[PDB]
Write a protein that binds this ligand. Structure first.
Ligand code: NI
Length: 341
């Protein structure tokens, strides 16, 4: 059965609710982004209308073979009417095609569902600025002050300089980057660009990337591994055994691997600056964990909420334990009293 925090009251609508079978009285299913926890249940057999971004619609059609007659892509930043209710999709600053959804209920309530997001001050000048929001369904993944991490830009700077240094010292080093879902494409694209290489990858990952409307992409990616010095592998193969094995397969073209694992937060963020990050090394293999986040830090989340001043907040993440729930409500209250709404 569908949980309450995936239901939009006063509408026939649900959000990211595809694993519950037919939801009672749902006339349209919204999908915020193509990540498996969110799309779980969709397939070629799905026969209700799905509302999403253009990019999420490309992935539905090509990766999950959802039939075209049930995919309803909407433009961003545009007022649209769905089953008699005005909606707007806004960029979520998460992975490609990820949106937030603004619902204008017939009775005059306004609801913002963030989907998964990384809050940014640029959001303070979208269509959000123009009106009041009564209810916020909030991505609370890192809703605790221990969750600090650098900007995306600082992390990319670190990775580019690291990769460029290594390959200039050793023209026979291979760079490998781990992946398991869409998102974080900038890590491997920026490295391949500084090295003047294309990124090499499996046919299935190349297909996924071809759905994302990235400009000049035929210029940046390839399935010919032999011509590339930046390879993508599944995240699970980013360990000393998986990488030794990959190196065997390259047939003596390379004698060193420099590998990156983009994680979200890890506790080494509470002690270490990005400048100070060091790899784990075994022989001719090094592995860097880099804190490239596509979710709000605690401070970024707080700033967005204190700007928006919603009347009620409903968390969508970390909702399964009483200790989590209690902690989150305490921070929402602090934020409200500090800013005076
Ligand atoms: Ni996500």
């Amino acid at each position: 059965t569908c949980p309450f925090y995936k239901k939009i009251p006063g509408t026939g609508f649900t959000v990211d609710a595809f694993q519950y079978g037919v939801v009672e009285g749902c006339t349209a299913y919204f999908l915020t982004h193509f990540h498996s926890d969110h799309y779980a249940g969709l397939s070629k057999h799905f026969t209700f209308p799905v509302y999403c971004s253009e990019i999420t619609g490309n992935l539905l059609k090509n990766k999950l073979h959802v039939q075209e007659q049930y995919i309803h892509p909407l433009p961003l930043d545009t007022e649209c009417i769905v089953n008699g209710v005005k909606v707007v999709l806004l960029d979520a600053n998460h992975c490609p095609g990820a949106v937030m959804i603004l619902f204008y209920l017939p009775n005059g309530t306004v609801i913002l569902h963030t989907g998964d997001f990384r809050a940014d001050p640029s959001m303070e000048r979208s269509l959000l600025a123009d009106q009041k929001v009564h209810m916020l369904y909030l991505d609370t993944t890192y809703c605790s002050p221990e969750y600090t991490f650098p900007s995306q830009q600082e992390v990319i700077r670190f990775a580019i300089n690291t990769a460029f240094e290594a390959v200039t010292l050793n023209p026979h080093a291979l760079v490998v980057c781990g992946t398991y879902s869409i998102g974080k494409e900038k890590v491997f694209l920026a490295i391949a660009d500084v090295l003047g290489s294309k990124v090499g990858m499996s046919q299935e990952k190349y297909k996924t990337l071809q759905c994302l409307n990235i400009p000049e992409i035929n210029s940046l990616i390839t399935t010919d591994m032999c011509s590339s010095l930046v390879h993508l592998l599944p995240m699970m193969q980013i360990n000393f055994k998986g990488l030794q094995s990959h190196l065997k397969k390259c047939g003596g073209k390379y004698n060193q691997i420099l590998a990156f694992r983009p994680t979200g937060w890890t506790h080494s963020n509470k002690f270490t600056r990005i400048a100070d990050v060091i790899p784990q090394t075994k022989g001719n293999i090094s592995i860097y964990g880099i804190p490239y986040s596509e979710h709000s830090s605690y401070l970024e989340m707080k700033r967005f909420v204190q700007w928006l001043k919603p009347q009620k907040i409903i968390p969508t993440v970390n909702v399964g334990t009483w200790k989590s729930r209690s902690t989150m409500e305490k921070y929402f209250r602090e934020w409200k009293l500090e800013a005076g709404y």
